[PDB]
Design a protein around this nucleic acid. Structure first.
Ligand SMILES: NC[C@@H]1O[C@H](O[C@H]2[C@@H](O)[C@H](O[C@@H]3[C@@H](O)[C@H](N)C[C@H](N)[C@H]3O[C@H]3O[C@H](CO)[C@@H](O)[C@H](O)[C@H]3N)O[C@@H]2CO)[C@H](N)[C@@H](O)[C@@H]1O
Ligand SMILES: NC[C@@H]1O[C@H](O[C@H]2[C@@H](O)[C@H](O[C@@H]3[C@@H](O)[C@H](N)C[C@H](N)[C@H]3O[C@H]3O[C@H](CO)[C@@H](O)[C@H](O)[C@H]3N)O[C@@H]2CO)[C@H](N)[C@@H](O)[C@@H]1O
Ligand SMILES: [K+]
Ligand SMILES: [K+]
Ligand SMILES: [Mg+2]
Ligand SMILES: [Mg+2]
Ligand SMILES: [Mg+2]
Ligand SMILES: [Mg+2]
Ligand SMILES: [Mg+2]
Ligand SMILES: [Mg+2]
Ligand SMILES: [Mg+2]
Ligand SMILES: [Mg+2]
Ligand SMILES: [Mg+2]
Ligand SMILES: [Mg+2]
Ligand SMILES: [Mg+2]
Ligand SMILES: [Mg+2]
Ligand SMILES: [Mg+2]
Ligand SMILES: [Mg+2]
Ligand SMILES: [Mg+2]
Ligand SMILES: [Mg+2]
Ligand SMILES: [Mg+2]
Ligand SMILES: [Mg+2]
Ligand SMILES: [Mg+2]
Ligand SMILES: [Mg+2]
Ligand SMILES: [Mg+2]
Ligand SMILES: [Mg+2]
Ligand SMILES: [Mg+2]
Ligand SMILES: [Mg+2]
Ligand SMILES: [Mg+2]
Ligand SMILES: [Mg+2]
Ligand SMILES: [Mg+2]
Ligand SMILES: [Mg+2]
Ligand SMILES: [Mg+2]
Ligand SMILES: [Mg+2]
Ligand SMILES: [Mg+2]
Ligand SMILES: [Mg+2]
Lengths: 101, 119, 88, 73
RNA sequence: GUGGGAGAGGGUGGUGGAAUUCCCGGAGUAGCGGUGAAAUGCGCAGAUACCGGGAGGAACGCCGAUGGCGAAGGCAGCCACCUGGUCCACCCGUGACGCUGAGGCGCGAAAGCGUGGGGAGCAAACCGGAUUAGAUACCCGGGUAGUCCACGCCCUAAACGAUGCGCGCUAGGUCUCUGGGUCUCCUGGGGGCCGAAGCUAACGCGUUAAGCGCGCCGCCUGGGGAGUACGGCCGCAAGGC
């Protein structure tokens, strides 16, 4: 059991129904792969520095989880299955490194 | 015939020649000109003077489309890049902005031996 | 990899007396742990040579320690080998 | 080279390891999308090394750019 | 052993953007390209320049360093997994368990070979243009093997610090990477520069010795003949020892 951060960028054009659906599927995958959700930050629609799948914006989701290591990669693959999912980046969590502290 | 009146101006400048394409704001070409479009044939196309004449010719043919103001985009290092810029500024087209879009790979493709000692 | 509880479990297993960390038995046991794990890694990943050098070094170290044990107390040597299931 | 001002010296306290923080990370990039050299950023070796990975992560997340156009040439 | 650290060390899967080429569409027209100057070449079956979309291969800009890691060859986008080495602090455990190392075994850049994939860019050979007294070349236009992946061979090199490995001893100064501490400074591990003593034919080396010493290994004995002949071992071959 190691601590990770799942970043997920979604389609900005999603309405309530489709978005809530995508979140439910995401959390169902997080459940199915044994990942326990600690803290969640939903940032939402934000500007991008470059277009992603033709869209100038993206819908940002951030999860902090504790899951088994061996399954991690696999989980990410699953998250990429969805058509409406733009980006998935799973980062092994780390302690902050301050400058000017 | 269009009647555009505002557009883009692309100066593609290499060591061997300078070609200038005036387009509508959607990017589609209206007119173009080069060192060889004017009388010049051999190495003389790479001349700054050739760039001046080319820029002016492109701008003229553009003002025939009723073009007034353009945005300049520059690609590539070579003489007559800045001469093309200056000629466009003196052209009778108001120049709004100038931008360097020159393409560079992030270590992408192997160069010809002439361009080597790099990648 | 090798976590803390695994390592402690094997240390307290081969410890001569309570508080024994670096005695030859414990050292050979630890080395054997790492070696079996690394050999398992090299069952796959046959193209990892650099790790394999590590394996070589560990095996050498273990063989040297065991040689010392054989030299000193043959019974403790026999017991250790029987326990870990080495050589052969 | 690096003749104006001190990127780290004027700035607050911040986590160098945070990829999601755009407003602070923008300051470490030039007119183009390029990561500024130490002589500009004013950071140290370790700091810089961390900054690079943070920025690259952010770029992949679509938060920061890779390259950019130069203006007023 | 416990605790803490830095790292392009290695293997597998995934994934990102830039650029090149090609394909489709749009707009547009007389050239583009290339050189010392040109020509071959490409373009009215619409090229070059510009925009939109798509496909594929390979390499990772900035960071990047006078930097880091590795025994060497060598290692650079990002993410996860697997995994090797190493440094520091505590002074906790074992109690000489050490060093070197003929043979053996393994690793070993590039090119090269085998089977099967792949093939954007580059390109031995080759086909052309030019240059020249000639031009089998340098320059330009094309271009196959190859460069890429998997598995299996080959075993070489200016494989270089042209400096075997280990330990102890012999002024300092200065820059740097990475730890710890009473944190202007002290202390440890790396990487550079100037230099005590000393050494060196000289050049230079000088706590990262080429100084003072001890241990073990490999090697040299004028030049050409010649890394050739003969023999043996290795290799599918090229060829190597
Ligand atoms: N990203 C996976 C990497 O794969 C490497 O090896 C793999 C890659 O070289 C390559 O993966 C795919 C390939 O399946 C497919 N046929 C074509 C694709 N372009 C390749 O990918 C790679 O190709 C080359 C590799 O030199 C790179 O230039 C390119 O950037 C990269 N995308 O083929 C190999 C087998 O899948 C190494 N295992 C390691 O670096 C890493 O795991
Ligand atoms: N080495 C690979 C890289 O390791 C980095 O992190 C590595 C280092 O930070 C860390 O070093 C630790 C050290 O902190 C700690 N104090 C002691 C430990 N023995 C070291 O680990 C070391 O030894 C073990 C075997 O015991 C190996 O498995 C491991 O690869 C090696 N680094 O071990 C990590 C794994 O090797 C990068 N974060 C990771 O992304 C990347 O894979
Ligand atoms: K000299
Ligand atoms: K034979
Ligand atoms: Mg020309
Ligand atoms: Mg490179
Ligand atoms: Mg290189
Ligand atoms: Mg690495
Ligand atoms: Mg077309
Ligand atoms: Mg016609
Ligand atoms: Mg055609
Ligand atoms: Mg193709
Ligand atoms: Mg550089
Ligand atoms: Mg080297
Ligand atoms: Mg003690
Ligand atoms: Mg005692
Ligand atoms: Mg040997
Ligand atoms: Mg080889
Ligand atoms: Mg090769
Ligand atoms: Mg082959
Ligand atoms: Mg070619
Ligand atoms: Mg050629
Ligand atoms: Mg062949
Ligand atoms: Mg063939
Ligand atoms: Mg091979
Ligand atoms: Mg050298
Ligand atoms: Mg050296
Ligand atoms: Mg040296
Ligand atoms: Mg030092
Ligand atoms: Mg030092
Ligand atoms: Mg002297
Ligand atoms: Mg000196
Ligand atoms: Mg010899
Ligand atoms: Mg002789
Ligand atoms: Mg003689
Ligand atoms: Mg020979």
């Amino acid at each position: 059991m190691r601590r990770y951060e799942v970043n997920i960028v979604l389609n900005p054009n999603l309405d309530q129904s489709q978005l809530a659906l995508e979140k439910e599927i995401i959390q169902r995958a997080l459940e199915n792969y044994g990942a326990r959700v600690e803290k969640v930050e939903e940032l939402g629609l934000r500007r991008l520095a470059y277009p992603i799948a033709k869209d100038p914006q993206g819908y940002f989701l951030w999860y902090q989880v504790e899951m088994p290591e061996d399954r991690v990669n696999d989980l990410a693959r699953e998250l990429r299955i969805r058509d409406n999912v733009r980006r998935v980046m799973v980062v092994k969590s780390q302690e902050p490194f301050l400058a000017n502290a | 015939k269009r009647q555009v009146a505002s557009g883009r101006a692309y100066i593609h400048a290499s060591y061997n020649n300078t070609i200038v394409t005036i387009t509508d704001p959607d990017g589609n070409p209206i007119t173009w000109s080069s060192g060889g479009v004017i009388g010049y044939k051999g190495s003389r196309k790479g001349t700054p003077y050739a760039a001046q004449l080319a820029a002016l010719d492109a701008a003229k043919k553009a003002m025939a489309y009723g073009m007034q103001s353009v945005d300049v985009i520059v690609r590539g290092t070579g003489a007559g890049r800045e001469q093309a810029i200056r000629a466009l500024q003196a052209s009778g087209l108001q120049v709004k902005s100038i931008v360097d879009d020159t393409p560079v790979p992030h270590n992408g493709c192997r160069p010809k031996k002439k361009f080597r000692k790099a990648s | 990899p090798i976590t803390k509880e695994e390592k402690q479990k094997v240390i307290q297993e081969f410890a001569r007396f309570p508080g024994d960390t670096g005695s030859t038995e414990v050292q050979v046991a630890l080395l054997t742990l790492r070696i079996n794990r690394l050999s398992e890694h090299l069952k796959v990943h046959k193209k990892d040579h650099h790790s394999h050098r590590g394996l070589l070094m560990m095996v050498g170290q273990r063989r040297r320690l065991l040689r010392y044990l054989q030299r000193e107390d043959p019974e403790r040597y026999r017991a250790l080998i029987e326990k870990l299931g080495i050589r052969g | 080279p690096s003749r104006k001002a001190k990127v780290k010296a004027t700035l607050g306290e911040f986590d160098l390891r945070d990829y999601r923080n755009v407003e602070v990370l923008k300051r470490f990039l030039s007119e183009t999308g390029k990561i500024l050299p130490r002589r500009r950023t004013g950071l140290s070796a370790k700091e810089q090394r961390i900054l690079a990975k943070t920025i690259k992560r952010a770029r992949i997340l679509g938060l920061l750019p890779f390259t950019e156009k130069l203006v007023r040439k």
